[PDB]
Design a protein around this ligand. Structure first.
Ligand SMILES: CC(C)(COP(=O)(O)OP(=O)(O)OC[C@H]1O[C@@H](n2cnc3c(N)ncnc32)[C@H](O)[C@@H]1OP(=O)(O)O)[C@@H](O)C(=O)NCCC(=O)NCCS
Ligand SMILES: CC(C)(COP(=O)(O)OP(=O)(O)OC[C@H]1O[C@@H](n2cnc3c(N)ncnc32)[C@H](O)[C@@H]1OP(=O)(O)O)[C@@H](O)C(=O)NCCC(=O)NCCS
Ligand SMILES: CC(C)(COP(=O)(O)OP(=O)(O)OC[C@H]1O[C@@H](n2cnc3c(N)ncnc32)[C@H](O)[C@@H]1OP(=O)(O)O)[C@@H](O)C(=O)NCCC(=O)NCCS
Ligand SMILES: CC(C)(COP(=O)(O)OP(=O)(O)OC[C@H]1O[C@@H](n2cnc3c(N)ncnc32)[C@H](O)[C@@H]1OP(=O)(O)O)[C@@H](O)C(=O)NCCC(=O)NCCS
Ligand SMILES: [Rb+]
Ligand SMILES: [Rb+]
Ligand SMILES: [Rb+]
Ligand SMILES: [Rb+]
Lengths: 390, 390, 386, 390
C-alpha cells in the first residue's frame, strides 16, 4: 500500500531559553497534533497511534508522546510512544508511522517529533551516595544529546573532522552560513513559512503571548560579524557559533494514511512517501550520514539524483552541509531554498519533521514533483526520505 | 514475508541497587546482543539495525542503543535507536523490528529492551536559576517511569483502582503473589531459566563477578510474612511491596529474520511472529491494558483464547494480573508456568522482551505450538504478541 | 585598660543579586580591613588578630576571616577566626576584640563582620545516598540565616507575633518604614554616608565597576504590597529589611596606644551586653540588652545623645522604641536597615559605623548601638566620644 | 579573677558515616552541655552563655549553638553563639569563655566544640542560573574544612611540606602512628576514657543505640600493616591514611566559672586555666603552628617546657606531630599518654575540647600539676592552653 502525508504542521522554532523557555515539549506536540488534524479534516477520535521522536524527555513524566496526544484530544483507546534516533528522530518517526500502515496494523498515524532543549534538566546519579568529594551535575542536553559517547567530544568537533577532510576553509563555511541566513530572512519576509507554521500560545500569568515566527532568523547577518566570531569547539578550529546550528525548541508532525483512505475523504495529500533509508557511518564524521542514506533512499525509489526537484538537507554544521552537497553533487540551488537549520534552528527530536514540513509545503508552493529530506545523526548515522507529489 | 525469531537471550534480572547497581543499561544490552548472535550462528557484521526499548536513559549519553551495538561488535554501517512505550517497550521493539523486515527495509534485526533503574539519576531544571528558596531534585525513575502524568499518583494506585473494580481482596492478591514466588523458585531450582539467561560479568576492580541467576527470587516465601506487610501506596489499601513487582535492572533481546532467511542458514527458529497488537485504555485502570490487546492480537492471528498452549502475562501487580486472568478467562495453569515479575523482577524497558524469552524457551522445552506474551503499560495501554512454533 | 575605636569603615550595602552578586564575602571584608588600617595610619604588620562575624560561609573555603585578613595585607604572624551570633555577629565581634585587649592577650584588633547573601549556595546532605524519591535542595540563606530552628517559620512570622502582642497596625508599621526611607534618602543626598563608606572595586571582565553608594536606598518611597509571610498578616516587603551584601569593621586598641600613635579615636567602648528572650517574640532582644549595657555603663536612658537600633522589621523596631522610651528623633537619624539593607553577619558593624561617624559629625558625647538576633537574643554596646 | 574548669565531658568520637552518621551536631552538643552541668551540680538556669566551636554548620539551621543550649535545657534568657577557627575551635572557645568571666561580663560559661562531618552537605551556588554545561557540587567538608584557601591543596599536602622540612621518613611517621594506636588501645581497655566520655543515645526508629566508646580505636596496629598503605595525597609522598587522622563526629565542652564560685558550691575543679595563646605561621607549613603558640602560652604562664607534667598535642598528621615534639623537646612519654587524634579521631570543631577533656581527666588520674594542650590550625595557625591542677 502507498502511504501519503495528508497534512503537516510545525510550531515556530524558538531560541534557547527564549519564547518556549518554560514550555514542556508535549505542550508543543499537542498543538502540532491538533493542527494536522484540522488541516486534513480528520477528527482526533480517528487517530490510531501517535509516534513522536524526542531526545531529551527527562523530567517530563511518563511517555510525553502520550501526554501530547491526550492534551490534543486523542482518545484513551489510541496508543502513543516516543523514539530516539537523535537528530533523525523527527523524520524516522514518520517512516515508522508509515510502516504501521504498510503492515496493516494501523489506519491513521500522527508522526513527528518534539524537543524542548531549554527544559532539559541537570542530573546526577545519587542512589549509591557520594561518600566524599565533589561530583558533577550533568547537563542532559550536552551529555545525552550533543556529546559523542565513543570519543567524548561535542558534535561540533565531529564537524571539525569533516572540515579537515574535505578541506573546507573558514571563509567557505561562513559564506554557507550567511547564505542560509539570507535565504531564511527572505522566505520569512515573503511569508513562505506561514503555511507550515501553526501559532503556539505561550500561556502566561501576566498575559498570553502568541508565537508564530521563528525567532532565530536574524535580520542583516553580515559576513564581517561572522568572521569575527571565535571558534566554539577547537580553539584553533573553524566551527563557530555563527556557522553552526544552535539550541532550540519546537515540534512538528504529519498525518499519515493510505492513498486510498485519503481518496475516500477527498483529501489532497501533500505527498506520497515512495522510499526511505537509514545508514550508519563513522562516528568521527557523523555529518556525512546523509551521503549514503540519500543514495540508499534514491535507490529504493528508483530515482537518480538528477530526478530530484527539491531537497531539504539539514544544516547541522556548515562543514558537514558543504560536504554532503559536494559529495552527492546535486544542484545547490534546489537544496534548502528557504534557508536551513543554521538560521532557523535545530530542535533535535523535531528537526527531522521540521525540514519535512518545509520540504512538503515548498513542493506544493512551486509544484515540485520529486523531493528528498535528509539529516545527519550523532553517533555516525544518517536518515533520508523521498517524497513524490500526487 | 514470514518473520521468525531465530534466537533470544536475556540477562539475569538484578535487584534494585543490587548486582547491577553501577552497570549502565547499554553494557547489559551489549552482552545480550552478542548472545543472540552466538546462539544463532550470525556474525555481528550481518546485523542491519538494533532496536532496544529503554524508559530511563537519562545520563547514559547519546543513544544508548547505539552504544550497545558498538560494544557488541556491530559495525558502524548498521544503525540503532531506542524507543519508549514504558513497560511494553521491550516487546514493542520486537514488533517494530519485525516490521522492518516485513516492509523489506532490513534483513536481520536485533530487537529487545534494556533498563537500569538503579542508574536512574535525580534531576532538576536549573537554567533559569533558583533565585531564592528550596527546590526539588526529581527522581527520574519515579517521575518518568512510575508516576502517571495525568492523575499524579504511582502505578500502585492504578492497581488499587483495578482491585476495587474487580473486587480483589488482600488475601487473593497475596495468594497470587505467593504462587508467583513458588513457581519461580521451583523453575530456578530445576534450572528452567538456564537456557534463556546469558551470564553477565560485572567488571569490578577487586575481581570480576559473574551474575547468572535472578537475584529477586525468594526461597521460602511464606504467606504469613506476606500478610504482615503494610500497604505501600494507600495507607488503607491492598497493594503492598510483597504483592507488587519491584525495581530491577536487566536486558533482553531477540534476533529477527525472515523464515526463508533462517531456512537458508539452517537455523531452527524459536518461533514465528504471527500477529501483534497494541490498544489503549483508561489511565486510571492501566493494568487492564492486556485485555483488549490480547483479544486484538488473537483476532489478527485468527486464534481463539482456547487455542493458546502457553501464556506469559506480565505481573506488574497482583491486582492487575488477577483481573486480566479473570476477564480473559484463559486457563491459569498455562499462564506464567515458571512465575512472573512479582518474583523475577520488573525492569520496565526490558520486561517486554524478558517475558518473550521465558515464553520462547518454555514453548521449546514442552513442545507448545501457540503462545502469547502481553504486558500492561502506564498511561493506559497494552501490548500483546502471538508466537507459533515452526 | 580602656579600649577605643581608632578608626572604622564599611562598604556600600549592595542589593540581593545586585552589585555584589558574584563577590565573595572575604573580598568585601579585605577592603574594609585595609580601610580601617589606612584611616588610622597603622601598618598591617601591627594587627594581632582579625575577628569577623559571618553567618553564611558555606562554599567560601577554610576560615574566610583568615582569607580576608591575608588578602588585606595582614601578615601571617597574625591570627583570624569567624563567629556566628546571627544578626548580632558584627557587633559581638567588636566586643570580643575589646576583650582580647582587656585581658592583655592582644594589642591591636580589627573586628567587624561580612556577609554575602547573594553568594549563599543551595545544599543537600548526600553522603548516605537518596535510594528513592525526591529530596530538597536547601537554601542555606533561608535555612541557616532566616528560619527559626525551634518553630520552623520565617523571621517575618516572628515579627507578626510582636506586631500582634504590641498591637501595631499596618499603617503604623508602614509609617515607620516611610520615615526610615526618608531619613536614609535624605542622608545619602547630604553625603552623610560618604565618610563611613569605603569604595569597593568590583573587578569585572568587561571593565571594573566602583561601588560607593548603598544601592538599596529607594527614591520617592510613597505611603499596596501583599504580606510576604502571613496570608492575613501585617509584615510586608516594604516594612521589612531585604537581603543584602556588605562588610564593616573597626580598629581596636587601648586608649594609651592610640595616644602614643597620635590617633584621634572615633569613640571608646564603655560597656556592652547581650541577653536572650523568647524565640516566639524575637526583636525585643534590644530591650533587655540595652538596659543591661546602660546599667554596666552607669548611664540612664536620657543620657544617650544618639541611638542606632537595627530595624529588622518595622514591628520589632516600634516595640523597642515604645518599651525603652528613648527619644525617637535621636534613633537612626540617617535611616535604618529597612531602607539601607540588612547584611546579617555585617549589620552589627554597619550600624556601629553609622553611629560612630554621626556622633563625630554632630558632636554627640554618648551613643548606643543595639540589634535583635534570631532565636531570641539581643546585643548592645555603649560608645562615648573623646 | 582566676578562672577554673569546674567540669568537662565529651562524647565518644564516631567514625565517618559510622555511629553518628545521621546525628546533627547540636544533638551531640546538647548531651555534652547537660553532662557538664550534672557533673558540676550546676543548674541550666545559671548558665550565662554557651560558646561552641563548629566549622561545618551548613544546613543545620539558625545558630546550632543556640539549638544545642535550648535542647539541653538552658533557658531562653541565656545567649549562645558559634565560632570558627578550624581545628583550634574547640580549644579557642574555652579561652573565649574564660575571657567572658575574666572581664566580668559573665559568671558561668559552657564552652567547647561540636562537629558532624558526616552530616556535611554538598552545595553549589545556583542563584544566577546554569545556562549551559556541567557544574560541580562542592563537598563543604573538603572545601570549608580540609582545603587550604590560599594554595588549594589538602591539609595532608601541608603535612608533606612539614615532613620534607624536618626530614621525616615514612618509617618514622609510621612508627609514631603505631605508638599512637597502641596507647589508645591500651587506654580504652583500661577504661581510662570512661570518666571523660558521656554516653550518647542514638535515637533510632528500630531501637535506640547507646554509643559510649570511640569507634576509631584500632586493635593491633602493626608497622607491617602500616607500611602496606598507599600515600593518600602525594603520589610519591609519605602521608597515608594510616599515619593521618581521619574524618569523625563528636562534641566536647567544659564548664567555666571563677575559682571563688566553685569554692562557694563545694565544687572541686578539674583544673585552672593559667594562660593561653594563638600564633600564626605560613599556611604551607600550618603543622608548625603549635610550636610558637605553645612557647607563647608557656611564657604567659611563666613556665618552662620542663615544668609540664602532662602534654596533649593534637596529632593532625604523624609528620606534623613529630616536628612539634622535636622542636619543643619535651619528654615524649608524657605526650598523648592515652593516644592521639591518629587513633581516636579528629572532629575539627570539637578536637580542641576533646584533647582538653583527655588532659583534664588524666591530670586528675595521675595527679599531674602542670599541663598543656595544643593543636595546629589550617591556614597557618596554632592554639595552646596551659592548665594547672588545684
Ligand atoms: C555553537 C554553540 C556552542 C553556541 O552557543 P554559545 O556557546 O552559548 O555562543 P552564543 O550562541 O551565545 O553566541 C556567541 C556570540 O556570537 C554571536 N553570534 C552568534 N551567532 C551569530 C551570527 N549568526 N551572526 C552574528 N553574530 C553571531 C552572539 O551574539 C554572541 O555574542 P556575545 O559573545 O557578545 O555573547 C551552540 O549553539 C551549539 O552547541 N550548537 C551545536 C548544536 C548541535 O550540535 N546540534 C546537533 C548537530 S547534529
Ligand atoms: C512496591 C514498592 C513501592 C516497594 O518499595 P520498597 O519499600 O523499596 O520495597 P522494599 O522491598 O525495599 O521494602 C519492603 C518491605 O517489605 C518486605 N518484603 C518485600 N517483599 C516481600 C516478600 N515478597 N515477602 C515478604 N516480605 C517482603 C521487605 O523486606 C521490606 O521490609 P524490610 O524493611 O525489613 O526490608 C516498589 O517496589 C515499587 O514502586 N514497585 C512498582 C513497580 C512498577 O510500578 N512497575 C510498573 C507497573 S506497569
Ligand atoms: C522582601 C522579602 C520579605 C521577600 O519578598 P520578595 O517578594 O520574595 O522579594 P522582594 O519583595 O524584594 O521583590 C521586590 C518587590 O517588592 C516591591 N516593593 C517592596 N518594597 C516596596 C516599597 N517599599 N515600595 C514599593 N514597592 C515595593 C517591588 O516593587 C517588587 O515587586 P515584585 O514583587 O512584583 O518584584 C525578603 O527581603 C526577606 O525575606 N526579608 C527577610 C528579612 C529578614 O529575615 N531579616 C533578618 C533579621 S530577623
Ligand atoms: C587521609 C584520608 C584522605 C583517608 O583516605 P581514605 O581512603 O578516605 O580513608 P579510608 O579509611 O576510607 O581508606 C583507608 C584504607 O586503608 C586502611 N587503613 C587505614 N588506616 C589503617 C591503619 N591505621 N592500619 C592499617 N590499615 C589501615 C583502611 O581499612 C582502608 O582500607 P580500604 O581499602 O578497604 O578502604 C582522610 O582521612 C583525611 O583527609 N584525613 C585528614 C583530615 C584532616 O585534614 N584534618 C585536619 C587536620 S589540620
Ligand atoms: Rb547560528
Ligand atoms: Rb515483590
Ligand atoms: Rb525593604
Ligand atoms: Rb587513622
Amino acid at each position: 500500500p502507498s502511504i501519503v502525508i495528508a497534512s503537516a504542521a510545525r510550531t515556530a522554532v524558538g531560541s534557547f531559553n527564549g519564547a518556549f523557555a518554560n514550555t514542556p515539549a508535549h505542550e508543543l506536540g499537542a498543538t502540532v497534533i491538533s493542527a494536522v488534524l484540522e488541516r486534513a479534516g480528520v477528527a482526533a477520535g480517528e487517530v490510531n497511534e501517535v509516534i513522536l521522536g524526542q531526545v531529551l524527555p527527562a523530567g517530563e513524566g511518563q511517555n510525553p508522546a502520550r501526554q501530547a496526544a491526550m492534551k490534543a484530544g486523542v482518545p484513551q483507546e489510541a496508543t502513543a510512544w516516543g523514539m530516539n534516533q537523535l537528530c533523525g528522530s523527527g523524520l524516522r518517526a514518520v517512516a515508522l508511522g508509515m510502516q504501521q500502515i504498510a503492515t496493516g496494523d494501523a489506519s491513521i498515524i500522527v508522526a513527528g517529533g518534539m524537543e524542548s532543549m531549554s527544559m532539559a534538566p541537570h542530573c546526577a546519579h545519587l542512589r549509591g551516595g557520594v561518600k566524599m568529594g565533589d561530583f558533577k551535575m550533568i547537563d542532559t542536553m550536552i551529555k545525552d544529546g550533543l556529546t559523542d559517547a565513543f570519543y567524548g567530544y561535542h558534535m561540533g568537533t565531529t564537524a571539525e573532522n569533516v572540515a579537515k577532510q574535505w578541506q573546507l576553509s573558514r571563509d567557505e563555511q561562513d559564506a554557507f552560513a550567511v547564505a542560509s541566513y539570507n535565504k531564511a530572512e527572505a522566505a520569512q519576509k515573503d511569508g513562505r513559512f506561514k503555511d507550515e507554521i501553526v501559532p503556539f500560545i505561550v500561556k502566561g500569568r501576566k498575559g498570553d503571548i502568541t508565537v508564530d515566527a521563528d525567532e532565530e532568523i536574524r535580520h542583516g547577518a553580515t559576513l564581517d560579524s561572522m568572521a569575527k566570531l571565535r571558534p566554539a569547539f577547537d580553539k584553533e578550529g573553524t566551527v563557530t557559533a555563527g556557522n553552526a546550528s544552535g539550541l532550540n525548541d519546537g515540534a512538528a508532525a504529519a498525518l499519515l494514511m493510505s492513498e486510498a483512505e485519503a481518496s475516500r475523504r477527498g483529501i489532497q495529500p501533500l505527498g506520497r512517501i515512495v522510499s526511505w533509508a537509514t545508514v550508519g557511518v563513522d562516528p568521527k564524521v557523523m555529518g556525512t550520514g546523509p551521503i549514503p542514506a540519500s543514495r540508499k533512499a534514491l535507490e529504493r525509489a528508483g530515482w537518480k539524483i538528477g530526478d530530484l526537484d527539491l531537497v531539504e538537507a539539514n544544516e547541522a554544521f556548515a562543514a558537514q552541509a558543504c560536504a554532503v552537497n559536494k559529495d552527492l553533487g546535486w544542484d545547490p540551488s534546489i537544496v534548502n531554498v528557504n534557508g536551513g537549520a543554521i538560521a532557523i534552528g535545530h530542535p533535535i527530536g523535531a528537526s527531522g519533521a521540521r525540514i519535512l514540513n518545509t520540504l512538503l509545503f515548498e513542493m506544493k508552493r512551486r509544484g515540485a514533483r520529486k523531493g528528498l529530506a535528509t539529516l545527519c545523526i550523532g553517533g555516525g548515522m544518517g536518515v533520508a526520505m523521498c517524497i513524490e507529489s500526487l
